[PDB]
Design a protein around this ligand. Sequence first.
Ligand SMILES: CN(C)c1ccc(N(Cc2cccc(Cl)c2)C(=O)Cc2cncc3ccccc23)nc1
Ligand SMILES: CN(C)c1ccc(N(Cc2cccc(Cl)c2)C(=O)Cc2cncc3ccccc23)nc1
Ligand SMILES: [Cl-]
Lengths: 305, 306
Amino acid sequence: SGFRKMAFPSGKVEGCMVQVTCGTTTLNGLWLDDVVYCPRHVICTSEDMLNPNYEDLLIRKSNHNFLVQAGNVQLRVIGHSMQNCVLKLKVDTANPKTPKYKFVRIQPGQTFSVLACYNGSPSGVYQCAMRPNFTIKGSFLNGSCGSVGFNIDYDCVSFCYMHHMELPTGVHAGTDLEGNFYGPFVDRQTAQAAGTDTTITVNVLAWLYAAVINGDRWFLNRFTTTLNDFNLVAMKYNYEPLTQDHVDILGPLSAQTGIAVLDMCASLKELLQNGMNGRTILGSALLEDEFTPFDVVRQCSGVTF
Amino acid sequence: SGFRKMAFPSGKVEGCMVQVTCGTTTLNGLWLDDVVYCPRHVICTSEDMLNPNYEDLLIRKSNHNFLVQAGNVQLRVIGHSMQNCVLKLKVDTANPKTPKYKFVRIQPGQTFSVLACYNGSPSGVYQCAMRPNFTIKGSFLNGSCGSVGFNIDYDCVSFCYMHHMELPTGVHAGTDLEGNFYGPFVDRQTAQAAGTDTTITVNVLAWLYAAVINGDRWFLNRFTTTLNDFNLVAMKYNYEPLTQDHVDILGPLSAQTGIAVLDMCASLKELLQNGMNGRTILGSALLEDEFTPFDVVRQCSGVTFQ
Ligand SMILES: CN(C)c1ccc(N(Cc2cccc(Cl)c2)C(=O)Cc2cncc3ccccc23)nc1
Ligand SMILES: CN(C)c1ccc(N(Cc2cccc(Cl)c2)C(=O)Cc2cncc3ccccc23)nc1
Ligand SMILES: [Cl-]
């Protein structure tokens, strides 16, 4: 019993974290095989960030300008290239701790673990979701750039996020490991803002199923609804639309608890319209949307890596 | 910016997790140097659990009755001894991945990361706190016994908890790494129950300072309180008494934000009286008590967003 915001074990990723220094800028790099991946803004000074021409800034650098440190060992950079907003530093040594891995681009609503790092040293691990507005509500200070997000499936680490920046509202923005930003953000010190966010409906429903599996059932009711009526209500409270794909994905949880997805949608409609009336669900007075249906099944079944 | 329930990176502990089997029972063990630590109830059957005589059960075992698996490698048990509620299995191989470590017994209110494991394989990592009633609100299924709690301040792993059981309310009980239980619990399936739990006041105050550091002050007020009047109010909402030690510990956070400890206590008194009125604090509609003053200093910026 119990239900916690659980991250994947971070060991396979910790063995890939390195410190990348270029001039006065120090940040984190991800060392996989013979390449170190890091944000391309490592080559910028504070003035450069105002309007950087990364190709022009990069052509002025030699391999020896990039200092890469793995633990207390200096790696030697033997090549460099840029792919979108990520800099790839070819090193002479393949990382002996390289796990089985893939680079995956995730969709909003999907969750992942973040291994927050400073100076190439892991500091903490936490779970978060890619918001519908493509930001992440992370916990990052200056120097955390290059920290990564990942998921694990079997023995394979799927890297999905690399940290680049903090927006004015305190939320965060970054790229996939191919350097493509999530959201309409750019790596330049210019006016940028997170758009209005919405709640991840399928994830709230998954968490309601998790509450039922854990004995919290006060919100259940005799009612059901239709997908169309539910979507009208959900749109009113800034909730993401629920699709037939989402209902299909919630099938296993619906079968285990005996509560149909539209039966749970009727519970969610009532909670949106009336609140919790002083009650809590899994220790929360807010409807939690950072657990996916897969996260709920995984935590409630004890899947290991 | 941001404030998350953050766990320590688990890699140093993952490299120590092993599977321990004794007969039909399989659980997790912690392999440090040439010793594997695990709950002594690994030698029990389901029937043995009501009134087990561990000394009598253990004397009937030989080293080769304990099967220890580290990855796909069988370790050889060359000795065994019981220390309180932990079994220590001496093995013929020192763990090459043994980090710098210490065993520490923690006090209620202290937080730690839990690396939940099944069959010697890590499943997830989350942050926990030792409740004032000595239980932990973990996430553990059957087979999670032997999973450990730890902190990793400055590259040294301080092991503070080993999981033993789940109480009827769905909360968890365990021991320190010397096998001493936290709380009035025993490793017997006799009628046991968690005592009435209370809120960790010093931690709620730490989290209110975290909210001020991150730029939010909506909950503050122009009032102060004496320590005694605060405690008289706090106890009415099932909050733990705040001691002078707690006031001293909050000193650094008070100095960084410019808000006196007893002034933050007056804000807490008002929050308890009024609720949040549709507002949130650091993304929460409840007063959070699983962040210590030390956790807030570690995670938050050293510069307040004034
Ligand atoms: C030195 N230099 C290379 C540098 C300096 C500052 C930054 N910026 C500004 C910025 C603004 C538009 C776009 C981008 Cl990509 C970057 C960041 O946002 C980094 C950052 C990341 N996470 C948490 C943070 C908390 C406080 C301050 C900064 C944080 N990036 C590079
Ligand atoms: C056979 N075997 C060794 C065994 C069997 C059962 C158990 N007990 C019962 C028990 C009750 C009083 C005290 C203790 Cl120490 C043990 C447990 O509580 C194990 C346990 C731990 N965590 C989460 C759980 C979730 C569901 C079911 C069990 C869980 N322990 C050992
Ligand atoms: Cl302590």
